[model samples]
Target: RYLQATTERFAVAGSFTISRGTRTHADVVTCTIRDGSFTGIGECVPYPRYGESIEGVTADIEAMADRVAAGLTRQELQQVMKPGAARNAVDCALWDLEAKMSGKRAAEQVLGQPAQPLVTAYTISLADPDTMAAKTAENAGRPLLKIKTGTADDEARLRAVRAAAPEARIIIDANEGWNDDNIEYYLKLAAELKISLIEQPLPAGKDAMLARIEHPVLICADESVHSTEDLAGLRDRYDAINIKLDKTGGLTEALVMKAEAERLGFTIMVGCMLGTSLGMAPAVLVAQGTAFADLDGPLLLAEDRDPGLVYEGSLVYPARPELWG
Candidate 1:
């Protein structure tokens, strides 16, 4: 058995901006495992927002080559590697490799069910109200739209987007851009705008306000919650949680987290960092019946890997054998 890691870059269609900043290109780390005649591959985006860098994530994966070659099980991987992009790439590669070796779909083998197509939310990057409105107008036909807003002008942005796409379901991702002083106002405004959900209105560790306030719009935890361990603490604060493979380390933990979050009565949202189709494939399984599907990473890219997930408008099809599981 052999493990190899590399960094690959894909240009964004234009640019993707959120509360943190803007990204023109997505730099991802890909881990490939080969055993005999079969090969498996996985990809992850090392987000700086989580303090991850491409070089750092690549090195982390490479450091695990010895263990992988010596027969590391996915369950054991969770114990050895901390949850992050590095483990996400390696863990997913292991899943793909296992599926290829056993001639079974990863989804069936892991989740005990076949993957299904999902209606994913298309995102409109944060910008001046007019720019965001124009972008919303372009995608007004999409069933679900996730509008990025974390600035003081969020009210204007929301109004502009809502006016442009009045019939579309809107979800706002503040990305920790709002504070205590404005959260109430924003929540009330979001309610008036008929927004479906609000994500990370406050920063992690500073989000206790969510529990005290009356939620007009459902609040989701993105940066605030990672693994199952964080779920319990967020119960009173958030109505939903965003599960990204990178944050959970991979599908292995993501599945576990999803089950626990649902059991706790929290709505599930399977999201993703900006990457190619390979990164989104494993997440599709976790998104099966989730409340929100933000797996449109490939759609935001200027070009995606060939044999990628099929997207017919906002509806994303399950991964074929040629792609992953």
Candidate 2:
């Protein structure tokens, strides 16, 4: 067995922006495990918001190169690497390799859920109300729209988007853009707009105020929760948590996070950082039974991996085992 890693950059169809920042391209690390002629591949986006970088992830993966080539199991992977993009890349590659070697559907072998048609939430990047409305109009028929926002005039942004696409179920992702002082106002405003969910309204470590207020719209934790260990504490402040493989380090941990979050009465919203379909494939598995599926990373990019997930408007087909299981 042999292991190799490389960084690949893909241009965004347009710009992907939130309160935090904007990017026109996605730089992702791809990990390949080769045994004989068959090879398994995995991809991960190193998010700066989480203090992960392409160089950092590549170095981390390189540290485990010997063990991985010697055939490290995902179980051992958990102890060897801390959760982040590095683990995510290796964990997913292991899953894909196992599926290929065993000649079984990875989904059935692991989670028992067959690849089915999944409806994903399309995102409208943060912009001026007019620009957002224009974006909303372009995707007016999508079933769900995740609106990105920061501390700016979000009320106007919401009103514009709502008016433009009244039929779309909405998830407002503040990305820790708003503070406690304005959370109440935003929540109430979201309620009036009939927003379905709100994500990370306040910055992490200072969102206790969420527990004090009535949740007019369901609130989701993104920056606040990383794994199952963080699930219990967030139940007080968040109605749901965003499960990104990037955040949990990989699907191995994300599966645990999802089950624990469900057991603790928190809704699930499986999301992703910007990447191609290879990056989004594993996340599709985690999206099963989720309240909100925000695995629309590929749709945001100008181009995606060949033989990628089949997307028809807002509905996304499951990733084939050939893609990553």
Candidate 3:
């Protein structure tokens, strides 16, 4: 195809505390890949917890500027960089570019099918039992609730929420917070509460403990499963794989990895890093037919992009591409 692209930058403030200890800094990153006069854009959230500071993501993208200017292919760029946030931006930009240039959407042009919009989960970030209970109450009536917990008190917090929102599908996201001692206890509690799924309960290095525990609570892999590299080892440890474009390096393999995960008997949960709608867009395609979706990233932003993903309670609509995907 014919091409030359300009990368642009944008940002917005994250509303509540996101992860680890990152501040409410602007989500600094680039967009706008050109194909002659036509163009497509992609977005990413540079997570400091992934050893990717805002500066590092920007630097990585900037280093690729010359190659991007030279119209580097996504495959070419991937060979040059390791899987992480930088490649996520470039790979997604490539998808957007192809969609725009072809007058088709990303899923159709890239995944060879029209993607359907799926309901994504709204997260209740980790906090004390009472605070977590308050959040669950606030989010009551939503179809799905992702409660953040990984402590000895996980049972109490989950019980409180399940009591509060019996109609909603309950999910426990430990973010690699729990361990061997309490996994069995939490699994029993989750079953009793009828919680739908338990995500990344054991620490990354501690997944081996899962083999010793009994089943019932469907275990999901988050931090433990990053890219295609980690899927095979996950069979005995996790029932589901939480795929994120940033972790896979972009939409190219998030979609591919989704298929692989399913083929291997792992149910899919398409998750996202905390970012605006752009970051949520690409993953929406992969979420088609997924067992769970956590694309509520924009809901957490203090300030969101104009024409953001409409969250009617917890229901998110398909994007118009003017926004993302």
Candidate 4:
């Protein structure tokens, strides 16, 4: 096997914002593993929030070109690189290559399920209550809406969104924007709005505030937990884990983390960074059994890859082999 890595940038349809910052474009590193006639492609979005950068990830994968060329199996690749963007790219490329060689879809090769259309939660970027409500109204027909919020007046934002899209299933992502003082206020608001999930209400180390509250709203661990190693104490704080391939480094660990999270009594929320369909393909495999799905990264883009996943309203079709695996 031989490998190639390159970086490219894609403009987001509009600005993308979370509690931490905002971005007008997504920079990603694409990795390809080739052996004879079989070539597999995988993409990773470098997130600074996780201490990852395109330059660092590209260098990391390039350093492993010889190893991949020497034939590194997925399991062996895990031992070679610490989990992050670089490993994620290679690991997924390996899976894609494996699926092609075996003449099977990635879902069949891995999860053994035919990739089906998934109902994804479309994101309503963090904005003022009026702006959020307007966005919600514009996308009111969407089945599920994922609202991004900040530390203050988020309840108002949620309330406005709820009123605008009353029938749409709603979930909120705070992205570690709140502290102990504000978590309860928003958690109570979430319960009132019938919001299904609240993601990372408190900062990572400060999530202990979750255990002190007893609300009907289910909380999810995002920054608070990455891979399974970060899973031990999350059960008491969160009802679900948002398993983004970026966060777990790639699909290899993500699959294992999903099973482990469930074993410990947490449901799963398959998610993604702002990326193209190339990056979301591997995540589709993980979303098969997750209780909630938010793989709508591509849907938020101005233009997606030519053969990307098909999105009709809120339903995202599974990826084709040409896209990945």
Candidate 5:
């Protein structure tokens, strides 16, 4: 067995902005593993919010080459690597490799069923109310819209988005930008705006305030919740958990976290960082029955890799074998 890691960049359509910052291109790390005649590939976005860079993640994956050549199993790989982008790429690559070697789809192996298409949330990048409204209007036909908000005037932005979309189900992701002083205000405003969900309104550590407040709208934990261990503590604070493969390390732990989160009564939202269809493909399996699917990363890119996942409007199709599991 041999392992190789490489860094790739995809240009974002215009730009993608949130509370933290903005980027014109998505820097991703891809891991490819070859065993005999079979080859497996996986991709992950190295997010700076998680203190990950393309170089760092690429090095991390490269560091595992010797171990992977030693016939590392996916389960064993989990114990060796911490949850994040590096492990995500390697783990998913292993899944793809296993499928190719066994002549079976990865979904059939793990899910015992074929992966299905899902309605994903189209993101409206953070901006002033009018600009957000215009963007919302452009995607108004989308069934679900995830609006990025973390500004001082989120109320106006929310109103403008709702006004533009009118009938679309809205989700507001503050990205931990709201403070204790105004969380309640925004929660109330979100409820009034007919917003369906609010994601990480308050910063992770400062979000204890959520347990004390009345949540008129469902609040999801994005930055606050990562693995299965983080779910129990978040029960009182969040109604849903956003499970990104990059955060969970890979589809392996993500599946575990999803089952655990559901048992703990938290709704599931399968999400993704900015990357091509390879990154989003494995996530489609996890998003099958989830409350929200934010696997629109490739949709935001100016160009995706060839044989990318097919997305018609907001509905994202499952990965074909040529793409991934």
Candidate 6:
């Protein structure tokens, strides 16, 4: 199309509720950056759990109206904003803007590395056992699958998926669905099924139960481990950490966390909320070094902005910052 050289917002409807013990919507916020001719895009989920709403986030960006008009650079933008949903939208937009203007691939610019093709895990949202299994059977050929399991029926759901897609590399994200009582039961189920990884087994605010248990399944930290701050204690409790720029604020901190996680020997996985390609672009740097990949945001959208980052299974292709680096 044409690059309009402006920024605007779009709302993505949540297809279904994840329905864990504590329900979370899958809605996302997309920021579109247009140039003279080509447009780039990025997105982030405005999590109510994180005190975010569409109006609140839109207002947050609106406050930056003056600085954006004054031609503030992304580096300056970093100082202008704090880490969280607000920064997530703008930081990603900045990358898309720069890539479009500089005419460089987002990955090459940020990572100094060429983009590598890879497959990403397709998510099986939480639902009844029968529905979950049917979805798994429909997508059985995918190389890997990320099953969202939180509330009740977690064990039944895992068993359903394993039966449907026996060969697919399985990963279960509890989104911290467990407490002290059921953590062991969940780990046992994961181990028995040979799932590769288990993410956020217990809720973020209440994760101390992991201290006393030992298990064969690899555990990952999500809400509990935002950046390097959560890395030290996480080693004994988690085998990996899921890095999302929105959670890390931007590529700057995400890069830092990735290095620290590597140094500390925790496997890294780059993922995103229901955001668009731009939101997923920055994480390319972290994704390059990660052991697991979940940068499938754009693919989830029914209508993603153009020049969206390409994807083949779980692997996301290199992107341009103008496209939301």
* TM-score of each prediction: 0.99, 0.98, 0.91, 0.97, 0.99, 0.86
Q: What Cα-based lDDT does every candidate model obtain?
A: 0.93, 0.88, 0.77, 0.87, 0.92, 0.72
Model 1 global lDDT (CA atoms, 0 to 1) = 0.93
- Encode model 3's per-residue lDDT on 160-201: one tens digit a residue: 888878899988888777777778888888898898898888
Clashing pairs in 1: none
In angstroms, the error of model 3 at 27 is: 2.4
What is every candidate's alpha-carbon RMSD to the true fold? 0.8, 1.0, 2.8, 1.1, 0.8, 3.6
Between which residue pairs do clashes occur in model 3?
5-34, 15-302
Ranking of predictions according to lDDT: 1, 5, 2, 4, 3, 6
Question: Which candidate number would show the highest lDDT if scored against the true structure?
Answer: 1
lDDT of 5 at 40: 97
- Candidate 4, residues 90-119, lDDT tens digits: the string is 889988999889888888877766878889
Candidate 5 lDDT over 127-161, as tens digits, reads 87899999999999999999999977787888899
TM-score for predicted model 5 compared with the true structure: 0.99
Compose the digit string of candidate 2's lDDT tens values, residues 135-190: 89999999999999976568889899999998989889999999867878888889
**lDDT, candidate 6, 1-325, per-residue tens:** 2211233444433343354442333455555545557555546667676677777766776677567656666688777887677666666666676777777766777667677766677887777889889989998999889888887557888899999999999998988666788888888988999899989988886876776689678888887875577788777677888988878776766777888989999888887776666666677667875688887666555666687778765556776443555
What is residue 100's positional error in candidate 3, in angstroms?
1.7
CA shift of 81, model 2, Å: 0.3
Off by more than 4 A, model 5: none
Deviation in angstroms for 199 in model 3?
A: 0.9
Give the per-residue lDDT of model 1 (tens digit) for 40-76. Answer: 9999989888999988999999999999999999999
**TM-score-better candidate, 2 vs 3:** 2
Weakest ten-residue segment in model 5 by summed lDDT: 151-160
Clashing pairs in 2: 13-302, 84-249
